[PDB]
Enzyme design. Structure first.
Site, PDB file in Angstrom:
ATOM      1  N   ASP A  80       0.777  -1.232   0.000  1.00 49.21           N
ATOM      2  CA  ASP A  80       0.000   0.000   0.000  1.00 49.21           C
ATOM      3  C   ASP A  80       0.816   1.294   0.000  1.00 49.21           C
ATOM      4  O   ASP A  80       1.322   1.710   1.036  1.00 49.21           O
ATOM      5  CB  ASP A  80      -0.991  -0.014   1.170  1.00 49.21           C
TER       6      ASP A  80
ATOM      7  N   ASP B 269      -1.418   5.609  -5.655  1.00 47.00           N
ATOM      8  CA  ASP B 269      -1.846   4.703  -4.586  1.00 47.00           C
ATOM      9  C   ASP B 269      -2.128   3.274  -5.053  1.00 47.00           C
ATOM     10  O   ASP B 269      -3.179   2.995  -5.630  1.00 47.00           O
ATOM     11  CB  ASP B 269      -3.061   5.294  -3.872  1.00 47.00           C
TER      12      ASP B 269
HETATM   13  N1  LIG Z   1      -5.961   4.559   0.972  1.00 52.17           N
HETATM   14  C1  LIG Z   1      -4.970   3.589   0.957  1.00 52.17           C
HETATM   15  N2  LIG Z   1      -4.179   3.434  -0.163  1.00 52.17           N
HETATM   16  N3  LIG Z   1      -4.770   2.792   2.083  1.00 52.17           N
HETATM   17  C2  LIG Z   1      -5.519   2.888   3.305  1.00 52.17           C
HETATM   18  O1  LIG Z   1      -6.432   3.690   3.463  1.00 52.17           O
HETATM   19  C3  LIG Z   1      -5.074   1.893   4.342  1.00 52.17           C
HETATM   20  N4  LIG Z   1      -6.225   1.597   5.188  1.00 52.17           N
HETATM   21  C4  LIG Z   1      -6.458   2.168   6.431  1.00 52.17           C
HETATM   22  C5  LIG Z   1      -5.565   3.136   7.075  1.00 52.17           C
HETATM   23  C6  LIG Z   1      -5.974   4.472   7.244  1.00 52.17           C
HETATM   24  C7  LIG Z   1      -5.119   5.403   7.857  1.00 52.17           C
HETATM   25  C8  LIG Z   1      -3.849   5.007   8.295  1.00 52.17           C
HETATM   26  C9  LIG Z   1      -3.430   3.681   8.130  1.00 52.17           C
HETATM   27  C10 LIG Z   1      -4.285   2.750   7.523  1.00 52.17           C
HETATM   28  C11 LIG Z   1      -7.651   1.632   6.890  1.00 52.17           C
HETATM   29  C12 LIG Z   1      -8.149   0.741   5.906  1.00 52.17           C
HETATM   30  C13 LIG Z   1      -7.249   0.716   4.849  1.00 52.17           C
HETATM   31  C14 LIG Z   1      -7.310  -0.042   3.586  1.00 52.17           C
HETATM   32  C15 LIG Z   1      -7.051  -1.423   3.501  1.00 52.17           C
HETATM   33  C16 LIG Z   1      -7.112  -2.091   2.260  1.00 52.17           C
HETATM   34  C17 LIG Z   1      -7.424  -1.376   1.087  1.00 52.17           C
HETATM   35  N5  LIG Z   1      -7.554  -1.891  -0.230  1.00 52.17           N
HETATM   36  C18 LIG Z   1      -8.157  -3.082  -0.623  1.00 52.17           C
HETATM   37  O2  LIG Z   1      -8.673  -3.932   0.089  1.00 52.17           O
HETATM   38  C19 LIG Z   1      -8.181  -3.338  -2.084  1.00 52.17           C
HETATM   39  C20 LIG Z   1      -9.267  -4.007  -2.682  1.00 52.17           C
HETATM   40  C21 LIG Z   1      -9.280  -4.230  -4.064  1.00 52.17           C
HETATM   41  C22 LIG Z   1      -8.211  -3.790  -4.850  1.00 52.17           C
HETATM   42  C23 LIG Z   1      -7.142  -3.121  -4.247  1.00 52.17           C
HETATM   43 BR1  LIG Z   1      -5.695  -2.518  -5.297  1.00 52.17          BR
HETATM   44  C24 LIG Z   1      -7.111  -2.890  -2.872  1.00 52.17           C
HETATM   45  C25 LIG Z   1      -7.682  -0.001   1.183  1.00 52.17           C
HETATM   46  C26 LIG Z   1      -7.622   0.658   2.410  1.00 52.17           C
END
Ligand SMILES: N=C(N)NC(=O)Cn1c(-c2ccccc2)ccc1-c1ccc(NC(=O)c2cccc(Br)c2)cc1
EC number: 3.4.23.46
Length: 360
Positions: free
Chosen positions: A30, A217
């Site tokens: 990520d 991202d």
């Molecule tokens: N915006 C980002 N690039 N990353 C985040 O927001 C990380 N995150 C957080 C988070 C928020 C703030 C600080 C630290 C972590 C919570 C939930 C997720 C989180 C976890 C997983 C995913 N992505 C997926 O599950 C995903 C699904 C299908 C395709 C793809 Br590519 C990714 C997105 C956000």
């Protein structure tokens, strides 16, 4: 050389190990966050997790993290442990680890990953910027150069790819590497100076493209565009693909659209060129994406509206080799060895073009 090719496999993940003895886990790559966070308590969607009690080299930091967002959250405690990437550099690093004990709408059913590897900068790390992100630990503790590369490949006719830490694998890309500066070290923030749909300029003020900000991202599927730009984009795509039309649930990324086997009329959908600011202010370069990228497999429209600025997610990174040159504060783009294309058009990285302000 590269035990790192094809080290990636609903998101892209890499295999890592945490603790002593090594605990094998699958971890989402990520670039849009900065915490190394792993499941550390049972969850319906988790088939394995980090067990701190089984780690001889675990150290508690006596500190919790709380991370709510619009839909759910994750909570856990903070610690440090020894972290390796088996199909990466041959090193072991003491990194911070957010052991997730409670969450909702964080883990995905059938995704096959148990944690997240935030590769963005300390500024956006939870609970604050004092929690050194993994890659910061890696560089400081080892001799690995302050750089990494991402080649996301997608499906094509399960996803694969390579994450190359500490360098650029020349066999992973074709032709010219073009660099856009990292505007600020928090997210991987860049500046889009113009966009066209099938060579047709949207002719919007530069600031609209980065309205709030524009980021690269890997943890987002879609190309997410600010309200104003999204509406202009879909209007231009609907017009180019007018010959036989689709339901408006398709354009909102809800409904899928199907043809059978290989009749898929790709040439009915236009290309999208994103022009990013060059290293010389005045200079710029374009990134051209095919419908094969923004229509992801039956297909879903993988361009969506954003209220938090532009997000250049997986569907735009796929088919490009993306270099995150933290050492020189820049992000390189080159046509990828694995890009999906027809015998008429190709994903392209072309420049220079001379073009501002643009930063919002
Ligand atoms: N915006 C980002 N690039 N990353 C985040 O927001 C990380 N995150 C957080 C988070 C928020 C703030 C600080 C630290 C972590 C919570 C939930 C997720 C989180 C976890 C997983 C995913 N992505 C997926 O599950 C995903 C699904 C299908 C395709 C793809 Br590519 C990714 C997105 C956000």
């Amino acid at each position: 050389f590269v035990e790192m090719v094809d080290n990636l496999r609903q998101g892209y993940y890499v295999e890592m190990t945490v603790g002593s003895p090594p605990q094998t886990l699958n971890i989402l790559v990520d670039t849009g966050s900065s915490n190394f966070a792993v499941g550390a308590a049972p969850h319906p969607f988790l088939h394995r997790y980090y067990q701190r009690q089984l780690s001889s080299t675990y150290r508690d930091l006596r500190k919790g993290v709380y991370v709510p967002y619009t839909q759910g959250k994750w909570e856990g405690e903070l610690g440090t442990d020894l972290v390796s990437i088996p199909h990466g550099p041959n090193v072991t690093v003491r990194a911070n680890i957010a052991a997730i004990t409670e969450s909702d709408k964080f883990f995905i059913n059938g995704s096959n990953w148990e944690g997240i590897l935030g590769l963005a900068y300390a500024e956006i790390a939870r609970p604050d910027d004092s929690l050194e992100p993994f890659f910061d630990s890696l560089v400081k503790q080892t001799h690995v150069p302050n750089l990494f590369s991402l080649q996301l490949c997608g499906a094509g006719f399960s996803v694969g790819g390579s994450m190359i830490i500490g360098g650029i694998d020349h066999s992973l890309y074709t032709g010219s590497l073009w660099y856009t500066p990292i505007r600020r070290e928090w997210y991987y923030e860049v500046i889009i100076v113009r966009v066209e749909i099938n060579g047709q300029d949207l002719k919007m003020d530069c600031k609209e493209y980065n309205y709030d900000k524009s980021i690269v991202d890997s943890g987002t599927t879609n190309l997410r565009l600010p309200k104003k730009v999204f509406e202009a984009a879909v209007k231009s795509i609907k017009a180019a693909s007018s010959t036989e039309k689709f339901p408006d649930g398709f354009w909102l990324g809800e409904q899928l659209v199907c043809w059978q086997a290989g009749t898929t009329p790709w040439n009915i959908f236009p290309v999208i060129s994103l022009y990013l600011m060059g290293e010389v202010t005045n200079q710029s370069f374009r990134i051209t994406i095919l419908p094969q990228q923004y229509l992801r497999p039956c297909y879903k429209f993988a361009i969506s509206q954003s209220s938090t600025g532009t997000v250049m997610g997986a569907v735009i990174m796929e088919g490009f080799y993306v270099v995150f040159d933290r050492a020189r504060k820049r992000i390189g783009f080159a046509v990828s060895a694995c890009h999906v294309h027809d015998e008429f058009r190709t994903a392209a990285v072309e420049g220079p073009f001379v073009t501002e302000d643009c930063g919002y």
